[PDB]
Amino acid sequence: SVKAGSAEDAAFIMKNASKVIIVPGYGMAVAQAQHALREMADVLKKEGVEVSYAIHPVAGRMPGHMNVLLAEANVPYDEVFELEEINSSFQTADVAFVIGANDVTNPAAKTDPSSPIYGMPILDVWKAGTVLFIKRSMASGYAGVENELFFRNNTMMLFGDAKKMTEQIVQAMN
Amino acid sequence: MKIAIPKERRPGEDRVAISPEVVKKLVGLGFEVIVEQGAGVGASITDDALTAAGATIASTAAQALSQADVVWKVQRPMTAEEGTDEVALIKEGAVLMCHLGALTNRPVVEALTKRKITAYAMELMPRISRAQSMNILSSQSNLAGYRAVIDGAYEFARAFPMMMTAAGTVPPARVLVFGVGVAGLQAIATAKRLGAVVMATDVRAATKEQVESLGGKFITVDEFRKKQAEAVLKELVKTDIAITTALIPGKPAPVLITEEMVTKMKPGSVIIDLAVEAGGNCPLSEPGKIVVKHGVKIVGHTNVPSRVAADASPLFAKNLLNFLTPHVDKDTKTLVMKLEDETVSGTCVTRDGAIVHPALT
Amino acid sequence: MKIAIPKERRPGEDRVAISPEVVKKLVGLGFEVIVEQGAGVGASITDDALTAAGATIASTAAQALSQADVVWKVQRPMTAEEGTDEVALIKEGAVLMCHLGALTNRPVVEALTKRKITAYAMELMPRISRAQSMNILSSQSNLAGYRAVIDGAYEFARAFPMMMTAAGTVPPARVLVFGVGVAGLQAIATAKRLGAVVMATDVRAATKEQVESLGGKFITVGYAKEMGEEFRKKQAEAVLKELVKTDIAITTALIPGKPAPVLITEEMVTKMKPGSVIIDLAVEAGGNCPLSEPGKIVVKHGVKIVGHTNVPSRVAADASPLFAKNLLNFLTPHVDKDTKTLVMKLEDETVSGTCVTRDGAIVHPA
Numbered sequence: 001s002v003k004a005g006s007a008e009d010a011a012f013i014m015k016n017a018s019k020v021i022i023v024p025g026y027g028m029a030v031a032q033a034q035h036a037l038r039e040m041a042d043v044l045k046k047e048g049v050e051v052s053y054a055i056h057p058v059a060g061r062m063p064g065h066m067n068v069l070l071a072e073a074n075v076p077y078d079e080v081f082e083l084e085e086i087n088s089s090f091q092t093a094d095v096a097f098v099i100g101a102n103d104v105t106n107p108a109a110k111t112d113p114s115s116p117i118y119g120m121p122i123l124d125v126w127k128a129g130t131v132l133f134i135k136r137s138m139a140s141g142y143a144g145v146e147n148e149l150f151f152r153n154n155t156m157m158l159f160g161d162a163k164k165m166t167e168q169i170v171q172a173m174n
Numbered sequence: 175m176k177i178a179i180p181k182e183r184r185p186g187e188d189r190v191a192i193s194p195e196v197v198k199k200l201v202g203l204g205f206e207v208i209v210e211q212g213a214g215v216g217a218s219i220t221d222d223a224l225t226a227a228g229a230t231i232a233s234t235a236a237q238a239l240s241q242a243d244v245v246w247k248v249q250r251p252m253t254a255e256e257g258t259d260e261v262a263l264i265k266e267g268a269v270l271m272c273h274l275g276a277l278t279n280r281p282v283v284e285a286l287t288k289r290k291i292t293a294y295a296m297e298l299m300p301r302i303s304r305a306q307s308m309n310i311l312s313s314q315s316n317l318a319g320y321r322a323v324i325d326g327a328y329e330f331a332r333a334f335p336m337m338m339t340a341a342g343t344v345p346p347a348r349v350l351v352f353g354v355g356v357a358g359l360q361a362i363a364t365a366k367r368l369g370a371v372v373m374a375t376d377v378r379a380a381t382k383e384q385v386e387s388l389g390g391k392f393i394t395v396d397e398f399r400k401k402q403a404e405a406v407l408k409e410l411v412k413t414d415i416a417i418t419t420a421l422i423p424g425k426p427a428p429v430l431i432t433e434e435m436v437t438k439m440k441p442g443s444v445i446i447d448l449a450v451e452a453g454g455n456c457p458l459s460e461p462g463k464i465v466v467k468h469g470v471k472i473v474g475h476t477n478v479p480s481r482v483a484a485d486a487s488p489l490f491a492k493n494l495l496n497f498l499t500p501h502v503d504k505d506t507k508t509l510v511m512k513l514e515d516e517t518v519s520g521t522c523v524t525r526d527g528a529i530v531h532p533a534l535t
Numbered sequence: 536m537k538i539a540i541p542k543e544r545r546p547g548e549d550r551v552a553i554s555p556e557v558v559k560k561l562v563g564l565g566f567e568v569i570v571e572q573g574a575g576v577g578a579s580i581t582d583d584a585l586t587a588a589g590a591t592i593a594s595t596a597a598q599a600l601s602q603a604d605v606v607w608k609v610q611r612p613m614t615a616e617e618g619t620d621e622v623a624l625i626k627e628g629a630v631l632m633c634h635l636g637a638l639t640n641r642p643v644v645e646a647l648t649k650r651k652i653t654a655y656a657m658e659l660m661p662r663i664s665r666a667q668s669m670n671i672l673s674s675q676s677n678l679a680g681y682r683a684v685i686d687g688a689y690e691f692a693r694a695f696p697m698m699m700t701a702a703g704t705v706p707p708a709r710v711l712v713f714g715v716g717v718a719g720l721q722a723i724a725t726a727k728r729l730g731a732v733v734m735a736t737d738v739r740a741a742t743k744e745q746v747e748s749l750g751g752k753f754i755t756v757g758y759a760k761e762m763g764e765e766f767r768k769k770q771a772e773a774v775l776k777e778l779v780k781t782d783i784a785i786t787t788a789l790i791p792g793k794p795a796p797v798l799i800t801e802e803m804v805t806k807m808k809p810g811s812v813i814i815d816l817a818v819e820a821g822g823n824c825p826l827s828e829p830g831k832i833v834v835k836h837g838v839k840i841v842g843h844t845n846v847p848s849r850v851a852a853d854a855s856p857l858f859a860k861n862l863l864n865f866l867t868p869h870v871d872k873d874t875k876t877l878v879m880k881l882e883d884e885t886v887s888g889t890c891v892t893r894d895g896a897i898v899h900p901a
């Protein structure tokens with residue numbers, strides 16, 4: 001079921017990759033992990049890896065929640081993409097780096113009609129070669145429902161605080 | 175079918191229920207799109223921009239609405255009792271989608287019913303995840319939260335950020351946001367990015383985490399807990415800009431800053447009362463006015479979303495588009511609104527000459 | 536010795552040449568500090584706060600100035616020709632420090648000369664590194680740069696930052712800063728804070744790296760010179776690709792002893808988007824845009840052209856303590872405590888550079 005991983009694991013997967021899509025959500029905001037996140041993108045772009053950000057229209061708890069924090073962290077606008085711009089790019093991506101997002105990626109929005117988030121559009125993060133979730137536990141999100149992708153074969157869970165874990169990933173990279 | 179969008183007639187309303195992008199999508203769905211001459215001028219949308227997008231221009235409101243099967247507006251249509259009978263301009267049997275205020279304006283609901291008009295009150299959109307894209311309350315109040323900070327910064331005689339200079343150091347502004355819904359959160363974000371030290375308070379306890387997720391500090395205390403009012407006052411006395419956003423539908427706005435509280439604020443302070451149309455979170459506020467009392471500016475602008483009309487209009491238009499889109503057939507040129515759809519049953523107030531919504535029947 | 540600070544009486548002037556902090560410093564130097572009643576109201580500085588800092592409160596401007604050995608003001612005193620004769624309120628032989636505008640206002644200079652008043656023009660502060668603490672031009676224009684963005688945002692019918700939302704994406708505003716001196720740098724920084732995409736241009740080469748370090752992008756084409764018509768065509772050409780996409784244009788460019796350079800012509804505003812805003816911070820010097828008018832917002836071709844006068848006074852409660860500290864830093868190295876007198880060293884560059892007249896004789900070569 002749950003394939004748990006560490007900062008050391010995430011470091012080589014993304015450095016061996018040639019394309020990484022970062023998926024920020026509410027947990028990123030709670031931990032104030034944006035500065036460590038952009039720092040991680042910088043050490044990736046220097047390595048030759050092309051990095052992007054996939055922003056769900058309702059990530060976080062307000063409109064533009066991810067935008068203001070990414071802007072605070074000096075993330076350039078040309079790396080930042082809305083759901084409809086970037087949903088077809090997961091196929092060509094080696095890694096979907098999902099940091100503090102959950103409902104935003106949950107496939108039960110397409111499947112389960114009794115799901116609270118049914119009909120809501122989502123980011124098809126599973127189409128990436130590898131998906132890594134950063135969150136503290138196996139707890140649900142705002143919708144209060146489980147996510148099928150945590151048990152999927154191409155998913156690695158990275159349990160920890162979003163700021164703490166991402167800081168360690170930058171340290172595990174050189 | 176023909177869909178029509180008139181100019182907003184209510185004083186100070188600069189928004190329009192259309193954008194060039196939404197025109198493009200509507201024509202693609204098989205609609206003839208008609209817009210009244212000069213309807214988008216307050217929203218920085220020219221007649222040429224809408225003709226380029228595929229819309230026809232009508233020279234008057236009556237001509238725009240004459241043969242329209244669907245009508246899109248921002249605010250509720252005016253009645254004969256208000257001196258300008260806009261509902262009479264709308265074709266009998268047609269579909270109206272707008273911000274109605276249906277639960278507080280029964281006369282317009284009755285006036286639409288007399289013409290057998292099917293009206294959908296967009297403010298009554300159910301709070302479900304798939305209808306977030308259709309929610310006009312959240313799209314407009316979010317910009318109002320941003321705008322509250324801009325208006326506050328404009329009326330304030332100091333700069334928002336801290337500045338370290340050869341001449342000396344000027345401190346940052348201190349901001350206190352009362353009520354942490356959509357508007358309150360965007361005010362926190364905007365105040366914060368401008369460099370202010372931001373505090374917030376809200377009666378709900380799940381708010382603390384949301385405030386902190388934007389770098390704001392939540393006001394806490396650590397039987398009769400009115401040490402809370404003490405903890406709020408302690409911060410309010412140091413506050414440069416207080417933004418109040420607390421709103422209760424159908425009811426008067428709760429009083430969060432009394433006149434006694436205002437007297438204890440420092441001179442040059444500014445209160446932005448976003449609840450001023452519902453009585454205000456501050457009694458000293460007056461609709462459409464900046465009042466000055468006890469050295470404090472009490473700012474009470476009406477229709478704050480219309481102060482961001484050029485960004486507010488495309489979002490309002492997208493909300494309507496998203497609401498209407500799942501009901502267009504285009505195998506026959508018909509708009510078949512589905513009754514088991516929760517967004518349809520939740521927003522429909524009257525149809526085929528009869529009031530439908532349970533709160534108004 | 537007595538130091539007095541009256542209320543600013545010129546229309547729209549909300550600043551004051553004092554703060555509680557500076558009062559204490561003057562008291563500790565050995566001055567008696569007198570402030571006119573209600574002088575700090577526009578700057579949010581109460582009579583009680585100055586009193587608590589150790590100042591006396593005089594009921595009128597005349598009563599404040601009557602026995603004052605030194606006088607601090609923001610703007611130049613009004614002459615009898617302008618209405619109320621403020622120069623006549625100042626005691627004979629006294630010292631005056633303010634933004635005098637001596638090079639463009641000779642009548643006030645001669646009026647101070649007739650009353651034997653020693654006048655120091657703070658705007659003529661020499662451009663040396665050690666005089667930055669006493670530089671009123673940079674302290675005030677820094678805040679004007681900030682305020683331009685705030686005025687821009689207020690007049691603008693759109694939001695500054697990018698917001699991705701359930702109702703679609705709100706795009707970021709595009710800001711173009713013309714002239715990257717002190718005001719321009721703060722304009723870039725404040726627009727950037729609000730989430731705008733910021734472009735900038737200037738004739739000085741050292742500016743490019745300053746724009747980039749603030750996260751702005753430079754448009755390739757001390758103070759500046761008059762570039763001429765040849766360069767103006769090439770500047771407008773390179774600028775136009777961005778200017779047609781620009782939401783807020785902030786123009787800050789000046790040239791000493793000359794009218795402000797034309798940077799956005801009426802033909803250029805014709806090509807701008809409807810709802811766009813131009814903030815002409817050079818409007819008092821003739822403007823970088825010919826359509827701007829002092830103290831007015833002009834609307835033409837779908838574009839708001841904003842030309843507020845006295846932009847520092849639109850931030851009066853920050854401007855005032857900074858202006859008062861500029862004055863303090865200029866005056867402090869010349870206070871002879873243990874003798875409690877003011878001996879302004881004539882050998883000092885800052886004294887010789889700013890002194891316009893003393894003891895009934897005009898000193899500055901102008």
Ligand SMILES: NC(=O)c1ccc[n+]([C@@H]2O[C@H](COP(=O)([O-])OP(=O)(O)OC[C@H]3O[C@@H](n4cnc5c(N)ncnc54)[C@H](OP(=O)(O)O)[C@@H]3O)[C@@H](O)[C@H]2O)c1
Binds near residue numbers: 057
């Ligand atoms: N944006 C809006 O305007 C808006 C409006 C209202 C509601 N919503 C709703 O909120 C949801 C937002 O989607 P989302 O992707 O942000 O999913 P989410 O439902 O907010 O999930 C957030 C995830 O972050 C984790 N987390 C919390 N604190 C953390 C920390 N310090 N470090 C690391 N992880 C942390 C949580 O798991 P752990 O506890 O296990 O770490 C949780 O699974 C949507 O369902 C949307 O409909 C949004």
Ligand SMILES: NC(=O)c1ccc[n+]([C@@H]2O[C@H](COP(=O)([O-])OP(=O)(O)OC[C@H]3O[C@@H](n4cnc5c(N)ncnc54)[C@H](O)[C@@H]3O)[C@@H](O)[C@H]2O)c1
Binds near residue numbers: 663673
């Ligand atoms: N405030 C001062 O008096 C002062 C003191 C010491 C050093 N300096 C240095 O000199 C610089 C000038 O700052 P300022 O605010 O005094 O300048 P300023 O107020 O004289 O003018 C603002 C800017 O406009 C530019 N400019 C003029 N004509 C132009 C044209 N046709 N096109 C484009 N740009 C044009 C100038 O190069 C200048 O940077 C500062 O960066 C500062 O570091 C200034």
